[PDB]
Ligand binder design. Structure first.
Ligand SMILES: CC(C)CCC[C@@H](C)[C@H]1CC[C@H]2[C@@H]3CC=C4C[C@@H](OC(=O)CCC(=O)O)CC[C@]4(C)[C@H]3CC[C@]12C
Ligand SMILES: CC(C)CCC[C@@H](C)[C@H]1CC[C@H]2[C@@H]3CC=C4C[C@@H](OC(=O)CCC(=O)O)CC[C@]4(C)[C@H]3CC[C@]12C
Ligand SMILES: CC(C)CCC[C@@H](C)[C@H]1CC[C@H]2[C@@H]3CC=C4C[C@@H](OC(=O)CCC(=O)O)CC[C@]4(C)[C@H]3CC[C@]12C
Ligand SMILES: CC(C)CCC[C@@H](C)[C@H]1CC[C@H]2[C@@H]3CC=C4C[C@@H](OC(=O)CCC(=O)O)CC[C@]4(C)[C@H]3CC[C@]12C
Ligand SMILES: CC(C)CCC[C@@H](C)[C@H]1CC[C@H]2[C@@H]3CC=C4C[C@@H](OC(=O)CCC(=O)O)CC[C@]4(C)[C@H]3CC[C@]12C
Ligand SMILES: CC(C)CCC[C@@H](C)[C@H]1CC[C@H]2[C@@H]3CC=C4C[C@@H](OC(=O)CCC(=O)O)CC[C@]4(C)[C@H]3CC[C@]12C
Ligand SMILES: CC(C)CCC[C@@H](C)[C@H]1CC[C@H]2[C@@H]3CC=C4C[C@@H](OC(=O)CCC(=O)O)CC[C@]4(C)[C@H]3CC[C@]12C
Ligand SMILES: CC(C)CCC[C@@H](C)[C@H]1CC[C@H]2[C@@H]3CC=C4C[C@@H](OC(=O)CCC(=O)O)CC[C@]4(C)[C@H]3CC[C@]12C
Ligand SMILES: CC(C)CCC[C@@H](C)[C@H]1CC[C@H]2[C@@H]3CC=C4C[C@@H](OC(=O)CCC(=O)O)CC[C@]4(C)[C@H]3CC[C@]12C
Ligand SMILES: CC(C)CCC[C@@H](C)[C@H]1CC[C@H]2[C@@H]3CC=C4C[C@@H](OC(=O)CCC(=O)O)CC[C@]4(C)[C@H]3CC[C@]12C
Ligand SMILES: CCC1(c2ccccc2)C(=O)NCNC1=O
Lengths: 614, 309
């Protein structure tokens, strides 16, 4: 099923004839499609294409097990694949790749409507291989924490030059990106080349606001852990390593967002004249220079097809709601630069972006380890709040239509009838019963009150039923929902926060130095450098040597051997297996001891016969 | 011994710190009140600020009772969850307030009352006052000619609706859930911490003077006079050496019985019983195989010797 899809999508054939002898080149194209992204497998590298063309001790694969694992995972031979995982090397890479392969064959088989037993069992094998990765990583963390880092970040040349961090995030395997080893390593990329492991927020902000405070900060050495993408003199390196550190580039974009948001408030509370004010020109700068940055994230993303780059970008929901608000603020500008009333309406459009850009402070707030899980808590409870909104919408419009029609009989077609359905009953949920208009005094002589509309006594009574259902039934049931969905959403949103930290370090490592209002200088540097170097890759890898590659390898088979050894020891000392082994040995006692008694019967009988003959 | 270390140990107790702060502000209020106007009203204002603190302290006063004290520590532990709610609600409140003030009043001038109108109306909106006359005021019509509707003023009831839904229904109920799931943990910790702070309670009131604060100046002058005249001219039991011998022997009895009862629980837990039985049964299998081989040889030798006889 896979080989038909990768050949039909390459050169549109259709159903390939079943006699097709699927080449290792063709297997390589299956591997790239299931992996996704920029993974370009060693089969379809241009050297092995030459080798297959020139052949159909340079025939044996240097590390055969790696190719066997991929062979057994693609053909669903699970017990064979788990034996291949133990016997070998780069096992951390092998388990995380097999976790992504098993998940990728899972949704492909469900898409092709292959039988459900295929899709369930491939998702079971994905959880098995992913669980072996956590239990190997934990065992590496117990022995030597520093060598576990090198295992997590070294450049996996046999797996399209990725690292074990990138492979797990691509596999969305949340527990691997939430273990203590990965989080304290992601902290090390966050602080960058700074060793300021204390009161981190205050010292970095004082470095930004007062640039002389950078010189009093403790910086790590040049060989502690060089996480990098592609491979007076103190004081210049001190400023450069500070103003490239990802935690520095965060708070320097954050004090420019808080500086933007403080400025835009001033232009809309205070009047706007015909031409833009000095404050408003800094605002207009911030939106468009951000729009160039949001454009940059699309073009310099992972895929190659422009539409596939766009599809990667639409996945992040905070990124797409940036560009909608940027285009909305542009529309608000062009109207604002015209004569009123066009200006008045572009004033209004400006104030509606305020509804968005304070809510984007929620995402900036997500960096903190306490407010961050609180924010993802809010998003999950709103799905429960939508069901509250639908049930409330029936009860609100049932009171609203009944009140507007009984109290106001002889009305005419107007859209204000629709407003009066939703106006008064909606504010009754929030503490205002509109007490003067509950039961207005009618049909009496105060002056002379107007005559009572027929059936107006029903309006207090259906008010009573509506306020009981709204405020003591459905709001109270929403409280009961929110408690009993709070625990599991808490446990999920901590681990999802710890998993989306990886996105947060890696994007800010790729964002420019200067803030959004000054990003036009760095953006001109990138455009000029790309054009001039033409005339004349992602992630932070450790890029290790060869003799350290051997050593990091030897650390890892000892972790495979010790993991499997403690698994055999825990099984052979668990109470379940001790009762089993005791019971089976006692069963083999009973045939034995009964045989001893029958033979001692013949021995005592032969002793009696010899006693007769002696 | 050092004065700064004395100050730091004293500054560990937070109530003590806020006491010294409140006494300094009451001193400042006294000085401004014993001057003349326009300073006497300011000293009165400082006095009325200080009564808020001297009323809250009642919670520390109430912290001796077995039921109220842990409740006060519970309130203190849920303040942090409220602080997170405060930040989130502040973001939503400022969004509605800025949108309201900028849309409804479009020709204002630089003034600090803009910041008041940002925060005033949305904040009282959370506590059951929707300010019904100013939700959608009638405009753009004659009934007297009402002033023309500001452009986009229809948005204000809609962002009102969304703000009140995300204020009174979402965040408050989420804080109910947050307080409600963490109540058990905070309860257990607050009872244990209250039982711990009772030591500081007894200790401090053992060392405090007898006369009340309004008459502690007599005990304080007695203390300074006693310190001078005697310079010139915890609660322990101080047991005898015999009783030291008895409490010592009591303590080896408890240490022995502790280790012995631990070894009994280890050698009567189901885990060790199953382990020990399994090891014995393994040795039994080797030995019964040996007895089988030997007695088979013995039966064969008995048959051969019976052939001999
Ligand atoms: C780093 C983060 C935490 C804060 C960065 C933002 C502030 C430094 C900015 C944002 C809003 C700015 C204010 C916006 C508007 C004005 C009015 C402006 O006055 C006028 O335009 C008319 C009178 C005159 O010309 O002085 C004087 C500067 C001031 C106070 C600005 C001072 C600088 C402020 C506080
Ligand atoms: C780049 C932003 C996002 C963050 C950094 C904030 C500051 C660099 C900005 C924010 C507010 C700005 C101020 C806003 C308004 C004014 C008034 C302006 O006054 C005049 O031009 C007076 C004469 C005239 O009216 O033409 C002088 C610049 C100044 C102080 C600006 C200086 C630069 C400030 C402090
Ligand atoms: C003044 C009035 C108009 C109030 C404004 C109401 C809305 C415009 C805001 C208020 C709260 C916001 C929500 C707060 C929390 C979240 C979770 C967050 O989403 C995520 O983190 C993605 C994962 C997830 O949804 O759990 C950002 C979107 C969302 C739904 C926000 C969407 C926009 C909302 C509904
Ligand atoms: C069940 C709950 C969760 C949602 C249902 C409530 C909303 C859909 C309602 C309640 C208040 C309504 C608003 C109340 C008042 C107005 C003003 C109205 O504008 C005018 O009447 C023009 C100005 C004027 O004539 O005074 C336009 C509709 C609107 C925004 C209404 C739109 C629909 C709203 C937001
Ligand atoms: C399942 C639930 C969501 C149903 C809710 C339906 C009502 C909210 C809708 C459906 C039909 C609507 C009516 C359809 C037609 C008209 C005529 C319309 O008249 C005009 O616009 C004036 C015509 C002119 O003079 O040009 C005013 C709104 C009104 C009463 C509408 C008011 C709102 C109504 C009752
Ligand atoms: C289904 C849930 C999740 C969302 C709620 C959707 C509806 C209940 C809202 C969305 C759009 C609203 C409408 C948007 C605009 C108007 C025009 C508005 O017209 C006026 O106020 C005319 C001016 C006047 O004379 O007063 C009357 C309310 C109405 C129909 C609103 C009624 C309530 C609607 C249908
Ligand atoms: C009239 C207006 C100004 C309202 C006043 C509100 C606050 C001044 C009060 C109300 C409840 C008080 C809280 C109630 C409970 C506690 C626990 C208590 O803390 C402890 O006992 C732990 C600290 C220690 O004793 O070492 C005293 C602080 C605190 C947070 C209090 C701090 C002051 C608060 C917030
Ligand atoms: C849960 C969190 C988000 C609450 C945060 C709300 C506060 C930051 C706001 C809400 C109401 C505000 C107050 C509303 C009114 C006033 C009166 C104002 O006094 C004057 O303007 C003096 C002259 C006059 O009274 O007209 C000074 C600011 C103050 C205390 C405001 C200070 C800031 C407050 C306390
Ligand atoms: C980004 C979030 C977290 C905080 C947003 C804070 C705003 C509510 C503050 C910060 C900048 C403030 C402005 C900074 C400068 C001024 C000028 C100031 O003008 C004067 O003081 C002139 C003399 C006078 O009229 O008193 C009036 C307040 C105002 C508009 C401030 C109003 C309130 C603002 C917008
Ligand atoms: C964790 C939470 C509780 C922190 C909340 C901090 C801010 C939201 C508060 C604290 C101090 C407040 C300020 C204290 C005093 C004033 C002066 C006040 O000025 C006036 O009212 C001037 C007189 C007039 O009304 O014209 C306007 C609100 C403002 C800026 C307040 C706005 C809201 C502030 C910044
Ligand atoms: C506009 C907000 C922001 C930002 C700032 C801090 C954290 C996350 C995002 C920015 O200032 N420029 C780059 N991207 C962005 O959207």
């Amino acid at each position: 099923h896979l080989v038909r899809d990768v050949k039909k999508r390459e050169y549109p054939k259709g159903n390939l004839p079943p006699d097709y002898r699927i080449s290792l080149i063709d297997i390589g194209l299956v591997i790239e499609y299931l992996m996704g992204g920029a993974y370009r497998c060693n089969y379809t590298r241009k050297r092995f294409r030459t080798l297959y063309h020139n052949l159909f001790e340079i025939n044996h694969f240097p590390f055969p097990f790696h190719e066997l694992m991929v062979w057994a995972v693609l053909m669903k031979r699970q017990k064979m694949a788990l034996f291949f995982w133990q016997h070998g090397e780069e096992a951390m890479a092998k388990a995380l790749v097999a976790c992504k392969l098993c998940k990728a064959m899972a949704h492909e088989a469900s898409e092709n409507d292959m039988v459900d037993d295929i899709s369930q069992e491939l998702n079971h094998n994905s959880r098995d291989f992913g669980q072996l990765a956590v239990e190997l990583l934990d065992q590496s963390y117990k022995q030597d924490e520093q060598l576990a880092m090198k295992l997590l970040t070294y450049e996996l040349k046999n797996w399209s030059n990725a690292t074990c961090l990138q492979l797990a995030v691509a596999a969305k395997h949340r527990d691997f990106i939430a273990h203590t080893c990965s989080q304290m390593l992601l902290t090390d990329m966050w602080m960058g080349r700074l060793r300021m492991r204390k009161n981190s927020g205050l010292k970095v902000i004082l470095g930004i606001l007062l640039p002389p405070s950078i010189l009093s900060l403790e910086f790590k050495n040049k060989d502690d852990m060089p996480y990098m993408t592609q491979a007076l003199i103190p004081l210049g390196r001190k400023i450069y390593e500070f103003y490239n550190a990802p935690i520095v580039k965060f708070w320097f974009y954050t004090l420019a967002y808080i500086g933007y948001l403080m400025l835009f408030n001033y232009i809309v509370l205070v009047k706007m004249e015909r031409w833009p004010s000095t404050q408003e020109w800094i605002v207009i700068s911030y939106i468009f220079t951000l729009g160039i940055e949001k454009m940059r994230e699309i073009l310099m993303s992972e895929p190659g097809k422009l539409l596939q780059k766009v599809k990667v970008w639409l996945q992040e929901y905070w990124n797409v709601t940036d560009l909608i608000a940027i285009l909305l603020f542009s529309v608000g500008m062009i109207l604002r630069l015209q004569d009123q009333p066009f200006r008045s309406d572009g004033r209004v459009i400006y104030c509606v972006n305020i509804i968005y850009w304070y809510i984007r402070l929620l995402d900036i707030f997500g960096v903190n380890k306490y407010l961050g899980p609180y924010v993802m808590m809010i998003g999950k409870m709103m799905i429960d709040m939508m069901y509250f909104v639908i049930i409330m919408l029936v009860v609100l419009m049932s009171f609203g239509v009944a009140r507007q029609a009984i109290l106001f009989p002889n009305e005419e077609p107007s859209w204000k009838l629709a407003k009066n359905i939703f106006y008064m009953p909606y504010w009754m949920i929030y503490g205002e019963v509109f007490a003067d208009q509950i039961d207005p005094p009618c049909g009496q002589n105060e002056i002379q009150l107007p005559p009572c509309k027929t059936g107006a006594w029903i309006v207090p009574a259906i008010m009573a039923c509506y306020l009981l259902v709204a405020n003591i039934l459905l709001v109270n049931l929403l409280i009961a929902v929110f408690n009993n969905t709070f625990f599991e959403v808490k446990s999920i949103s901590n681990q999802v926060w710890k998993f989306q930290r990886y996105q947060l370090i890696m994007t800010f490592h790729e964002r420019p130095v200067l803030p959004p209002p000054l990003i036009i200088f760095s953006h001109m540097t990138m455009i000029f450098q790309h054009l001039c170097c033409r005339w004349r890759d992602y992630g932070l890898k450790l890029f290790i040597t060869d003799d350290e590659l051997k050593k990091v390898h030897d650390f890892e088979e000892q972790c495979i051997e010790e993991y499997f050894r403690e698994k055999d020891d825990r099984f052979n000392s668990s109470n379940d297996e001790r009762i089993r082994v005791t019971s089976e040995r006692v069963e083999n006692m009973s045939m034995r001891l009964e045989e001893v008694n029958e033979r001692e019967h013949s021995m005592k009988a032969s002793l009696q016969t010899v006693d007769i003959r002696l």
